[PDB]
Amino acid sequence: ATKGRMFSSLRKSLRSCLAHNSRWRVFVINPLTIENFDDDIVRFIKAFVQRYSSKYLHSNPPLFMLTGDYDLSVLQKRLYDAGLRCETGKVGGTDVIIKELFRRPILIRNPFRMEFSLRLAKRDEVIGGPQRRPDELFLINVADDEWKHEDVNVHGFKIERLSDLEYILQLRSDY
Amino acid sequence: ATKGRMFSSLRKSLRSCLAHNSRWRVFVINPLTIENFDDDIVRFIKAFVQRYSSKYLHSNPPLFMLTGDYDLSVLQKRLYDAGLRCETGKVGGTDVIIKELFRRPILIRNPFRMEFSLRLAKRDEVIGGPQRRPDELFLINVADDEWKHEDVNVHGFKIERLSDLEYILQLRSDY
Amino acid sequence: ATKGRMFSSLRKSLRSCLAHNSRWRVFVINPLTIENFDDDIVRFIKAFVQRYSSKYLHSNPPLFMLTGDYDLSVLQKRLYDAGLRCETGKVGGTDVIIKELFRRPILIRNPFRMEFSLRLAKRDEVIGGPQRRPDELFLINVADDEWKHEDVNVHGFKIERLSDLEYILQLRSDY
Amino acid sequence: ATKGRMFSSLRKSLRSCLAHNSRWRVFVINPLTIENFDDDIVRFIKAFVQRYSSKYLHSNPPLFMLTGDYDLSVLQKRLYDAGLRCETGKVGGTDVIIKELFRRPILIRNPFRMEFSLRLAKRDEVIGGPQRRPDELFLINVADDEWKHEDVNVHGFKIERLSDLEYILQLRSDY
Amino acid sequence: ATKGRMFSSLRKSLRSCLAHNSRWRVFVINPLTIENFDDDIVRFIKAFVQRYSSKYLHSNPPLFMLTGDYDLSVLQKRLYDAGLRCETGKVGGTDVIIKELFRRPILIRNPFRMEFSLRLAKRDEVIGGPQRRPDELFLINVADDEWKHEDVNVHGFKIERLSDLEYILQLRSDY
Amino acid sequence: ATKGRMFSSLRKSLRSCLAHNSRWRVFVINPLTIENFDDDIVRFIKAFVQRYSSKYLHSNPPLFMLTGDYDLSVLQKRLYDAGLRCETGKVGGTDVIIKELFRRPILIRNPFRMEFSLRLAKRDEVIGGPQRRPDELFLINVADDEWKHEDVNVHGFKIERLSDLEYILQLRSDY
């Protein structure tokens, strides 16, 4: 199983990167080459937020970006009905203001409430870059990107079905 | 055998979910093709309740839903004799009010007291849907249901005897 | 050999039950077909009581029922010599008052004191059943008994000598 | 060879017995058959007392009896030189008094101090028996004894060197 | 091939040394004989700082000394862009002072802040010796250095890529 | 080949003695045969002290005795440069006063401090013995000494490099 070994060793690589509590993680994806995405995506985001963005010491939420012509509004509605709230980065819905998408949330401890658990954007509309470079960048099926830099960890994969990523990221045991 | 193998992987598949103290779990069962049902059901429920609805942080109790012409009146008395109080939803005798079958119970810590430990209804009398969606829906031997949804996890199975499921859900440790 | 594997398989079926501090356990035993019973009975009881009936959380004590025409007085005197106390259920006469044999003891947390550790009786002289049915009903070398029911867990064995049981109930580490 | 595995088997039959903090243990030994008794006796008693009689929770110290013709004065002196104190049972004369030997010691917690850490005698001198019977009796290279009873956990071995016994008593790691 | 074993052994030799919280560690590196160094150095240094210089019990920051004609001005800026502060020993002028480099930093516990995390230098510019001979010295592709002494725990390696050393120093999980 | 097992056997034999905190240990050494002694002696002593004489619960420091024509002064100066302090038993004069070498040090808990960490002396000079006998006596490359007695654990080895002992005594992880 040459391919299965790829996933197993890749899972063993990324261990220390995800042990930390506070880190700036960023994801990019392309959905035209992932089978059964529209049905499989919300379960994924809820599982990730439940493991790595559902406590106090988890200061910085993740950023999911997408490529293509995908329609985000419907996904925002579905995630809201699921139970989560997102920072779109918009004021009026015209176009993204960078400064808001990359801001710090309000955190209370007793009782724990978190202003938002995730960030959601599209890649084209996000024109520019942040002030503090990302610690990790996860490129799921995208060849090139503009945030690649020498001093940023970078990972690049090709997955056919999302479950594989759920295994790489300690969310389901069986491949 | 073949079935001996699959159940191990399925037992391992659900270890993450059941660790969460708070969750909404829903069970749908069919007793026509389950051998030796009328004898084992009470013990199954008793073990489940002691495992996952016996403490404080176990907030939301589960929902066992049966399909067919079963008789609940006898089961509720057998259970009261065993020591468990149940929530059917009836106020008057005839029909089920969806709002009362999904309410939150009173919880006293010191000394620990529960208003109830389980909720039980027949599937046909429960005409409607819930305000919030279930997290996990176990469909033991039922082909299709109305509450299937993309954003809701679904595990569908076939089992010969109720002893087969106690292994899957960590109530026994052989087979 | 193969018979040992039987005992090993049993040792596991019974693990979770004994992990519970409080539970109503019952024993029915037949001495006619056990080897060297009168030589080992007291060692067996003393071990069981030390492991499962010597702490405050262990509120419900066990019952040992012996079938056959046997002499309890001598065993009781031996047990008093051994340091234990018992609850025969009798008040100065032959008859066995049932309400007095299934009562709760007095417990003082600091310092540890216990009114009685074990319950002892003879099956012929018990006419009736407890209001709260037993969680476990072991049946060592007896075929059928009256307290068998659908919602009572039953475990029926055959044993050549008592050293075989101690291994099943986690008193002696090896076979 | 095969004998060593027998020793390894005996080693784990005794693990529960010795885990207890308060227990009365007794030993009988026959020097004539053991090689290098005089050379290793003190080392053995010192290890045993370092592990099993060197704390407050360790209430009842052990009892070492030796049969045959042998001198206890030399051993008592060598032990005093080693650092340990012993209870002979004498009140100045040439006769023993059982109450004095089987008495309880003074125990202070802070700073921990023990009136005596062991008991020593010759079997021929001790004419009688104890009020409470031993929980464990270890016969070393002796067949019979008056204190054997159906309600005592008698253990019997045959040894050639004292290094073999230490392994059974969880002191030396290797054989 | 066979090369894996050597590194696996080194990884185990150096475990006790890297457990200690406070210790004076020194590093020498020659870049001419390493592939893709400019790209890796920064991630290497950051991964090292996180594990061994990101607490209050981590007293002495480590020292990195390069060999050759390398340009420090660029690296010292890249590290600031990454989020780190360094001590060079320079006071305005081109000359290097021994006292200011081997200096203890201000550490405030609650809240946690550190004057500096790392020390950087070019070998040839550093003339003299320290006050306390180092506890460990690491030679990476260097044959001889003056500080080699008979009371210093030297370790000499030979590497092809920096990812190897991260394995040796416990930074990454697998080769 | 076989030597690997001899040393691992010894390593496993002495695991119990060293777990203890307070204890009297003596070493006798004969450098005429050991290869590369002057080079590794100080690293040995520092490693040994860091683990067995660096806490407050470690009351008795160890004693290192060396045989033959050898000059201690230089080693004492070297251990001073390293960061340690030794007790030689000399009140000015060359003669060795025994009552001042086996004394108890001053120990403050918070803040920690040790008056001295190790003892060091030549064997020919020490004329006498201790008031209280030593628990363990490690003889390396020496036949017989005057402190051997039946009530002491007299270990004897034969080694040619000093790392061997570092493995036996648990300072180095792997042979």
How is this structure best described in words?
The structure is cut from a larger assembly and holds 6 copies of chain A (175 residues). The termini of chain A are close together. With 175 residues, chain A is α/β, with parallel strands linked by helices. In chain A, the strands form 2 sheets. In chain A, strands 3-6-2-1-7-8 form a 6-stranded parallel β-sheet, with helices on one face. Chain A has 5 helices and 8 strands; from the N terminus they run αβαβαβαβββββα. In chain A, strand 1, helix 2 and strand 2 form a beta-alpha-beta unit. The interface between B and C is small, with 13 and 10 residues.
Oligomeric state: part of a larger assembly
Beta content of chain A: 15-25%
The major sheet of chain A is characterized as: 6 strands, parallel
Choose one word for the global shape of chain A.
globular
Q: How do the SSEs of chain A run, as a string of H and E?
A: HEHEHEHEEEEEH
Terminal CA distance of chain A reads: 12 Å
Helix content of chain A: 25-40%
Cα-based radius of gyration of chain A, to the nearest Å: 16 Å
Structural class of chain A: alpha/beta
What's the number of helices of chain A? 5
How many distinct beta strands of chain A? 8
**Largest interface, counted by CB within 8 Å of the partner chain's CB:** B-C, 13 and 10 residues
Strand order of the largest sheet of chain A: 3-6-2-1-7-8
